[PDB]
Amino acid sequence: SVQQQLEALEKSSGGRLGVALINTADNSQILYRADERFAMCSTSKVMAAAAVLKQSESDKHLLNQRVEIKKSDLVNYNPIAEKHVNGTMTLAELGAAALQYSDNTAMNKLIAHLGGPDKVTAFARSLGDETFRLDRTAPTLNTAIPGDPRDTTTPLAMAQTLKNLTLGKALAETQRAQLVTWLKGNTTGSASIRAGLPKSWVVGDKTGSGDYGTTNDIAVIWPENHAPLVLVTYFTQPEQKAERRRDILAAAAKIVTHGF
């Protein structure tokens, strides 16, 4: 069975696997440690970007508002922001960079505008997500220390919220479409969930990487002849310097999407 397959995958993986798939055709779900907390790492950027999109609903000039990028803003990974030092990036461009290239500086600019990590949590709560919590900025929000509650959520919680954000009631249509466009254009998830699905399927996703070999990916999947699927695959390991295992995410995705 699917459950036995996931258990077998986890057993040989040397880590802890968290999976939550929602089939929007009948709202049925495939869950594996779906109620356990996992460090979200960069997958948390979706909530920060969505928070700004929500604001843009009542501020028509927000997305085009320029933000100055200084050398001091650069952190551990910022392939897009680095290209704009001494210049500016609009909030929309920061949203794009944060989601499609997982630019950590872009994420920090989004948090800074919103007023801090706690403001992202407040946004998640307003969506009915009582699990999500953002406590730090990038890159420390990716320490993924075992048992640390900071910057964590559960696979089911994130799956429900991602569904609400991309296919549901969370955002106004234009903003919802914008978030979807950003997710579909992600460049960082080839080897993750996407690697375990038919090549013709359209996918939007946000990956995450951190210490303890934490390897995450959250996605919305559009089959060619079926209703969308929302999938969260989180993976973490016992040693701080473990390698990321995107192959495990691809494997989990293949397992739970069999038949769709």
| Known binding residues for substrate | 206-208
Among 56, 104, 108, 237, binds ligand CEF (CB under 6 A): 104
Contacting residue, 23, 30, 38, 77, with ligand CEF by CB under 6 A: 77
Is 166 among the residues that bind ligand CEF (CB under 6 A)?
no
Return the SS3 of 186: coil
- For the bound state, the minimum distance from the C-beta of residue 183 to ligand CEF, rounded and expressed in Å, comes to 12
By the rule CB under 6 A, 236 interacts with ligand CEF: no
Choose among 60, 19, 63, 20: nearest CA to 182. 63
Instruction: Name the one residue in this structure whose structure tokens are 């919680």.
Output: 157
CB of 64 to ligand CEF, least distance (A): 26
**Judged by CB under 6 A, which of 23, 153, 166, 188 binds ligand CEF?**
188
Distance between CA atoms of residues 205 and 207, nearest Å: 7
Q: Does 18 bind ligand CEF (CB under 6 A)?
A: no
Q: Are strands 202-210 and 229-236 parallel, antiparallel or unpaired?
A: unpaired
Does residue 117 bind ligand CEF (CB under 6 A)?
no
What is the token pair recorded at 194? 């996407």
Closest by CA position to 232, among listed 160, 182, 176: 160
Binding flag, residue 139, ligand CEF (CB under 6 A): yes
Q: Distance between CA 253 and CA 54 in Å, rounded?
A: 30
- Of the listed 13, 28, 42, 126, which one is catalytic? 42
Per the annotation, the verdict on 12 as an active-site residue is no
**Chain centre distance of CA 150:** 16
- For residue 42, the SS3 value is helix
Q: Which is nearer to ligand CEF, 102 or 237 (CB)?
A: 102
Indicate the SS3 state at residue 30. strand
Phi, psi of 31 (to 5 degrees): -120, 140
CB of 27 or CB of 72, closer to ligand CEF: 72
Give yes or no for residue 143 binding ligand CEF (CB under 6 A): yes
3-state SS, residue 79: coil
Binding mask 205-224 for ligand CEF (x = CB under 6 A): --xxxxx-------------
Among 41, 69, 232, 252, binds ligand CEF (CB under 6 A): 41
Quick check: 105 and 86 in contact, CB under 8 A? no
- Residues near ligand CEF (CB under 6 A) are 41-42, 76-77, 102, 104, 139, 142-143, 188, 207-211
Residue numbers annotated as active site: 42
